[PDB]
């Protein structure tokens, strides 16, 4: 048994992870979706304050990502993505998270350039009749609050589940002994009733909402509000035919809300450009569908389905004036629409076991994507040249791939060539000022971005020793990347990259007591196009790991290790960064026990940033003027934190 943090995340089949995202890890996270990423190789996360991070994977940024929930995609509506896919995710909540690196599968959705990740829960399994709850609380170093409930009865014909969690804490603080604003709070309730009439079939209804706030150090406004709120329905039925093994289908609601202001959680900077107090609402409304059976005979195993979905977005703005302080609210003014997309498609997935040692895997997607701006004019107001102009594309997307079980020891191999094509997403057509040169604006002339890549890689699962171990290399046409001129403006461009680079780890039990395992990722791109270096990837990571286990004690130590990053672009990036200056490197220590006093209750603790090191990381974003930055000084990370947990199970 034994308990114990945790400090990272090995890669258990090909090109796959999987964790469980109610166990605690070790530096600890803002109960948000990038967080709990930052234990797996090859994720680093753009820091816009306390919470509410921007996920990279591979140096790969926004909708390149595939981040589903329950099976549904959950988009926020900043313009300026404050509210990213995973800042609406409580993990603690979901029962299972699992990431697939590369365009290495077509089943989830249309363009996973970079990867696709998936928030899941299991349905009840039950029986008897009866009951199970399980939760959590949590109490850290800075004002840091966490309750976590997760619950749910039924018998052997349905369940009912409630689950939800409450979270905040106050302003953290740094190395330097500076309070950096980064103040949040967030809480979420959802409910799901299943149906099961008997074990071949089973029918669940969905729902749930939450909100949340916070301050966000490197930007102009500050979130007072993201109301998340989702319907969701799916069916499951299982050995239709004999050949014919599952049948999923699955709609999905998401609606996100979001407020932000100026002086709702700061107040407006005097020598900015808003002196004025600013507020701005804006939704986003996503629909979808899933359907697909998944066949098994002989020595195969073929799924294949279609799915579909819309999202619309719409925004609303304050308004305050010249000779009087009255300062209307956004509330009462009408809604205005900007874009819909839809988007159609049809996929299928292969596998032939070949043998005891072999397996290929094949799969194909058809997609169609399509987008109306609804834009009549543009921010005091132009006219939109575009407006109910309408776009649509269709991108075919597949990939192969081979892997190996070795003739005696317990190795896999694999290599998979990929070819991914994916439409531009709200913040590609949208949120630039300025399109490509000689483009009216960025929504006529932006191409989808098409990305050819190789994925290798490989397993060992020893006794004493586990390591793995993958690697990419890969050219992306049509690119899409921003890039800064002095207000202060944007442009979105195609341009054409070549990418690669990759991630290994190990895990070795040196005694019975004693375990160790480290990991090291690394990224590297160019932009073929200017022969400069792509802007915005991770440095080289490298992290190390000991451990100590005795019956039902666990002691625990992370170093983690970061290079400089020098190959830069200035003055380009995505559609929240921009680079400027190179990265000093640096290392951050920490420690962490866990102890379990019965079956029902275990105890844990850690210390994050023994040493109180001031930094910054590369990717996390510029200060905010007003707020005590210097020009370009990045938002620093945490000093020393305390935090213990507490988790029940019965
Ligand atoms: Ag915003
Ligand atoms: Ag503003």
């Given at each position: 048994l034994a308990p114990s943090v945790v400090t990272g995340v090995a890669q258990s089949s090909p090109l796959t992870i999987v964790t469980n995202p109610k166990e605690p890890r070790q530096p600890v996270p803002a109960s948000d979706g990038a967080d709990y990423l930052k234990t797996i190789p090859g994720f680093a996360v753009i820091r816009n304050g306390g919470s509410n991070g921007d996920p990279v994977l591979r140096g790969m940024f926004g909708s390149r990502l595939n981040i589903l929930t329950n099976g549904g995609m959950m988009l926020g509506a900043c313009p300026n993505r404050m509210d990213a896919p995973t800042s609406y995710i409580s993990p603690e909540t979901y029962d299972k998270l699992t990431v697939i690196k590369g365009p290495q599968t077509v089943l989830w959705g249309p363009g996973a350039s970079a990867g696709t990740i998936l928030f899941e829960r299991e349905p009840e399994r039950f029986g008897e009749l009866g009951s199970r709850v399980n939760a959590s609380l949590l109490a850290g170093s800075n004002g840091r609050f966490d309750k976590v409930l997760d619950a749910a009865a039924g018998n052997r014909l349905g369940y009912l589940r409630f689950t939800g969690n409450h979270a905040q804490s106050d302003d953290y603080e740094d190395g330097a002994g500076n309070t950096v604003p980064s103040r949040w709070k967030k809480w979420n309730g959802d409910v799901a009733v299943g149906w099961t009439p008997d074990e071949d079939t089973l029918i669940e209804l969905t729902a749930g909402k939450g909100?949340?706030?916070?301050?966000?150090?490197?930007?102009?406004?500050?979130?007072?509000?993201?109301?998340?709120?989702s319907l969701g329905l799916r069916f499951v039925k299982s050995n239709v035919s004999d050949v014919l093994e599952k049948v999923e289908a699955q709609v999905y609601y998401n609606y996100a809300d979001a407020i932000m202001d100026n002086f709702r959680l700061r107040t407006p900077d005097p020598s900015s450009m808003m002196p004025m107090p600013m507020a701005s609402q804006v939704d986003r409304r996503t629909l979808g569908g899933r359907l697909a059976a998944t066949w098994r005979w002989d020595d195969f195993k073929l799924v294949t389905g279609v799915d579909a979905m819309r999202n619309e977005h719409r925004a609303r703005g304050s308004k305050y004036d010249m000779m009087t302080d009255y300062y209307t609210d956004a509330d009462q003014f009408p809604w205005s629409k900007d874009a819909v997309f839809h988007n159609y498609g049809a996929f299928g997935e292969l596998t032939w076991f070949a043998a005891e040692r072999d397996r290929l895997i094949g799969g194909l997607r058809l997609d169609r994507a399509s987008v109306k701006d609804y834009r009549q004019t543009l921010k005091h107001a132009m006219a939109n040249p575009t407006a109910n102009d309408t776009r649509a594309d269709t991108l075919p997307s597949g990939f192969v791939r081979y892997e190996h079980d070795l003739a005696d020891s317990p190795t896999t191999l694999y290599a998979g060539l990929g070819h991914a094509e994916r439409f531009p997403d709200y913040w590609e057509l949208f949120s630039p000022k300025r399109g490509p040169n000689g483009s009216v604006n960025a929504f006529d002339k932006i191409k989808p971005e098409k990305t050819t890549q190789l994925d290798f890689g490989l397993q060992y699962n020893g006794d004493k020793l586990q390591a793995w171990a993958s690697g990419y290399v890969g050219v992306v046409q049509d690119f899409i990347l921003f890039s800064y001129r002095e207000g202060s403006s944007t442009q979105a461009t195609n341009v054409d990259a070549r990418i690669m680079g990759g991630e290994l780890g190990a895990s070795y039990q040196l005694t019975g007591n004693w375990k160790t395992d480290a990991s090291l990722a690394y990224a590297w791109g160019k932009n073929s196009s200017d022969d400069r270096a792509l802007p915005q990837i991770?440095?080289?990571?490298?992290?190390?790991?000991?451990?100590?286990?005795?019956?039902?004690?666990?002691?625990?130590?992370?170093?983690?290790?970061?290079?400089?990053?020098?190959?830069?672009?200035?003055?380009?990036?995505?559609?929240?960064?921009?680079?400027?200056?190179?990265?000093?490197?640096?290392?951050?220590?920490?420690?962490?026990?866990?102890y379990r006093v019965t079956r029902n209750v275990k105890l844990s603790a850690g210390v994050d940033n023994l040493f109180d090191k001031d930094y910054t990381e590369h990717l996390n974003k510029a200060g905010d003027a007003g707020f005590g930055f210097s020009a370009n000084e990045t938002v620093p990370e945490p000093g020393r934190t305390f935090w213990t947990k507490v988790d029940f199970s019965f």
């Amino acid at each position: 048994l034994a308990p114990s943090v945790v400090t990272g995340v090995a890669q258990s089949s090909p090109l796959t992870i999987v964790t469980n995202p109610k166990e605690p890890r070790q530096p600890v996270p803002a109960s948000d979706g990038a967080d709990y990423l930052k234990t797996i190789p090859g994720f680093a996360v753009i820091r816009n304050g306390g919470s509410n991070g921007d996920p990279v994977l591979r140096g790969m940024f926004g909708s390149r990502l595939n981040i589903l929930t329950n099976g549904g995609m959950m988009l926020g509506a900043c313009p300026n993505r404050m509210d990213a896919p995973t800042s609406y995710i409580s993990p603690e909540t979901y029962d299972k998270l699992t990431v697939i690196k590369g365009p290495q599968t077509v089943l989830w959705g249309p363009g996973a350039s970079a990867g696709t990740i998936l928030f899941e829960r299991e349905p009840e399994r039950f029986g008897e009749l009866g009951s199970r709850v399980n939760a959590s609380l949590l109490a850290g170093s800075n004002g840091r609050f966490d309750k976590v409930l997760d619950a749910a009865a039924g018998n052997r014909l349905g369940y009912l589940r409630f689950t939800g969690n409450h979270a905040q804490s106050d302003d953290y603080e740094d190395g330097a002994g500076n309070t950096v604003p980064s103040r949040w709070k967030k809480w979420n309730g959802d409910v799901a009733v299943g149906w099961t009439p008997d074990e071949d079939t089973l029918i669940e209804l969905t729902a749930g909402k939450g909100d949340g706030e916070a301050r966000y150090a490197g930007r102009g406004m500050d979130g007072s509000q993201f109301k998340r709120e989702s319907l969701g329905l799916r069916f499951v039925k299982s050995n239709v035919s004999d050949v014919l093994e599952k049948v999923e289908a699955q709609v999905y609601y998401n609606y996100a809300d979001a407020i932000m202001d100026n002086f709702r959680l700061r107040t407006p900077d005097p020598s900015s450009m808003m002196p004025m107090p600013m507020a701005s609402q804006v939704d986003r409304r996503t629909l979808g569908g899933r359907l697909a059976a998944t066949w098994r005979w002989d020595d195969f195993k073929l799924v294949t389905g279609v799915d579909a979905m819309r999202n619309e977005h719409r925004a609303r703005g304050s308004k305050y004036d010249m000779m009087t302080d009255y300062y209307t609210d956004a509330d009462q003014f009408p809604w205005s629409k900007d874009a819909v997309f839809h988007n159609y498609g049809a996929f299928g997935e292969l596998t032939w076991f070949a043998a005891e040692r072999d397996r290929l895997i094949g799969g194909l997607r058809l997609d169609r994507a399509s987008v109306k701006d609804y834009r009549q004019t543009l921010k005091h107001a132009m006219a939109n040249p575009t407006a109910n102009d309408t776009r649509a594309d269709t991108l075919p997307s597949g990939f192969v791939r081979y892997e190996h079980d070795l003739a005696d020891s317990p190795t896999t191999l694999y290599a998979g060539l990929g070819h991914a094509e994916r439409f531009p997403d709200y913040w590609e057509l949208f949120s630039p000022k300025r399109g490509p040169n000689g483009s009216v604006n960025a929504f006529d002339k932006i191409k989808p971005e098409k990305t050819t890549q190789l994925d290798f890689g490989l397993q060992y699962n020893g006794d004493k020793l586990q390591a793995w171990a993958s690697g990419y290399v890969g050219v992306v046409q049509d690119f899409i990347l921003f890039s800064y001129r002095e207000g202060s403006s944007t442009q979105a461009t195609n341009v054409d990259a070549r990418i690669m680079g990759g991630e290994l780890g190990a895990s070795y039990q040196l005694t019975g007591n004693w375990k160790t395992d480290a990991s090291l990722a690394y990224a590297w791109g160019k932009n073929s196009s200017d022969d400069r270096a792509l802007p915005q990837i991770p440095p080289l990571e490298a992290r190390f790991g000991l451990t100590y286990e005795e019956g039902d004690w666990s002691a625990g130590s992370l170093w983690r290790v970061v290079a400089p990053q020098n190959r830069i672009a200035r003055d380009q990036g995505n559609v929240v960064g921009k680079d400027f200056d190179k990265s000093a490197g640096f290392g951050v220590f920490s420690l962490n026990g866990a102890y379990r006093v019965t079956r029902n209750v275990k105890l844990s603790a850690g210390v994050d940033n023994l040493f109180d090191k001031d930094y910054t990381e590369h990717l996390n974003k510029a200060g905010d003027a007003g707020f005590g930055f210097s020009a370009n000084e990045t938002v620093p990370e945490p000093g020393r934190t305390f935090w213990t947990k507490v988790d029940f199970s019965f």
